[PDB]
Symmetry: D2
Subunit: 163 residues, 4 copies
């Protein structure tokens, strides 16, 4: 089935800028991974935001919900920061307009542009999850699927975990 | 305290995915399993046992090699299996495994890479992530996971000139 | 001739840490480059500091000067941040105890662990400079050799330039 | 306003440094010059003109190939030259160039890589930086810059089994 990928920012997309003396959320790394993936099927990417997910407001989550509803596609990947991925995912789970879609959130604990990143694995795993899971909203990280309503980010473990 | 389960086992048979440069050869050999390098930085919740079966270019596989892969997969207790392999005779191995009654309750996915993981611009890491998800989520059967898609081995062939798996119409 | 490499930190050595939500100055990247360089000769690496060079004090520059004087070797590479590389280099140029040494400072505008970094090139170029230049103190960046006394960092160009 | 000079010219002749995977070949070919990829992110003050002479494994070089490299280097106006090349017959090309009176005023450095730049764990970027410095800083003559050292071609041989240039005692 056609997959629509929305990019909202996060650590996955961070890149170094000399002006900042550090990282900024940069161009979406999922486009760099899919460029070499030799894809057979119909996939397209849309930018929604370039924010660290710590910076997301309730107005941002509402805007993300409406944007995902602008896609006719029933299989959606949203790349996002991990720090408020649960808050977005739980918000999207409450939108009756998205009930027929499979919506998977993912991202990376280490930027794709930094050595030793989880990003490319996570993108492959999450694209499969978006194609194969039944309608609902899910987090695909750490090589497994999480139910947002029963998940939290454990900042001491650096992992999502059950509540 | 919650214990993270480990329901996937991976077997490695070689292929372009695992190729690495050797100075003594003036070229590539089939080297150490690249899937182990991808999983090292995947930040997995579980742990994945990785078992080496062979280190061959799949052009070099014989019927006896295919039979030996089938015996190893049938011995596994896990019902979710990823086999990394060369793409050139991946369909032959997948169709062979499909005919084995000892695999009937297992989800067995074959994958690899058209470009070595250790070469720049490789599909390998994406393919591993996709294929791990497919091994978890697909019903029992035998599948090829490549190009961000699932292929039925009976209805698929390798197009070597264009470096892709394609349907038989 | 034997080369002694001192690592003082800088952007070259930055690496991502989940706890920080960003980069820290991490393990010296020159050790990662030399591990695959297939070296023939005698080279050794010593850690001096893990600081962003913005954070260096006059006490730090004095301590760097004494540390370089602890090396018997007459060919020295000091990896360092670019923001106060001129201040360190000018300070070391004034130390009569270092007059017989060839001391080359280098680093990278982009961290070695980030994609698209100048670091490995810069390390190769700077190791040659440390071996081949006459006694003195030099900055080796941008594929050329700078005299510290006649150089400044241009933060608008992202380059060292003559004064 | 100050103008950054460009005193180095680079010539590319191929070698392991430039190898890249090709699916059609099921293996490596000598591809696009890797030195161009290193210089793209080097943040150079100048600009370096890069000129392709050949795309060969140096095992394949003939006397006529060596003569054609000499003519191209002698034509250059620059007196600082880096030639990227295969390591297997780098000494033969370097000793040949050494005997050419048209190069007597030039600093000519040959370099390459034991591992392709496009393979993980390559010496190539380091070697390019080192060799660019050597081409700038060394007196007129012909040199091999490898292993973080400068070699005199008349006193050097390639040890293929151990993947290194070494002195003749
Ligand atoms: N602070 C980042 C962390 C991450 O993405 O891992 C974010 O949530 O955007
Ligand atoms: N000849 C290789 C091709 C590949 O894996 O893409 C193999 O089948 O092992
Ligand atoms: N702020 C960094 C900048 C750099 O190294 O390029 C430092 O001077 O440590
Ligand atoms: N056979 C290769 C070896 C190398 O470059 O290291 C060549 O000489 O082109
Ligand atoms: Cl080897
Ligand atoms: Cl090969
Ligand atoms: Cl795939
Ligand atoms: Cl940062
Ligand atoms: Cl190709
Ligand atoms: Cl070298």
């Amino acid at each position: 089935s056609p997959l629509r990928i929305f990019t909202a920012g996060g650590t996955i997309d961070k890149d170094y800028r000399l002006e900042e003396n550090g990282l900024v959320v940069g161009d979406p790394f999922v486009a760099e991974v899919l460029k070499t993936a030799r894809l057979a099927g119909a996939v397209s990417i849309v930018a929604l935001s370039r924010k660290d997910s710590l910076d997301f407001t309730e107005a941002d989550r509402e805007a993300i919900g409406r944007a995902v509803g602008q896609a006719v596609e029933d299989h959606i990947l949203l790349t996002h920061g991990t720090d408020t991925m649960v808050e977005t995912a739980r918000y999207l789970g409450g939108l009756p307009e998205l009930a027929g879609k499979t919506v998977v959130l993912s991202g990376a604990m280490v930027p794709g542009r930094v050595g030793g990143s989880d990003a490319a694995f996570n993108i492959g795993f999450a694209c499969a999850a978006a194609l194969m899971l039944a309608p609902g909203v899910y987090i695909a990280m750490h090589g497994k699927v999480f139910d947002p309503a029963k998940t939290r980010k454990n900042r001491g473990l650096g992992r999502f975990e059950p509540i």
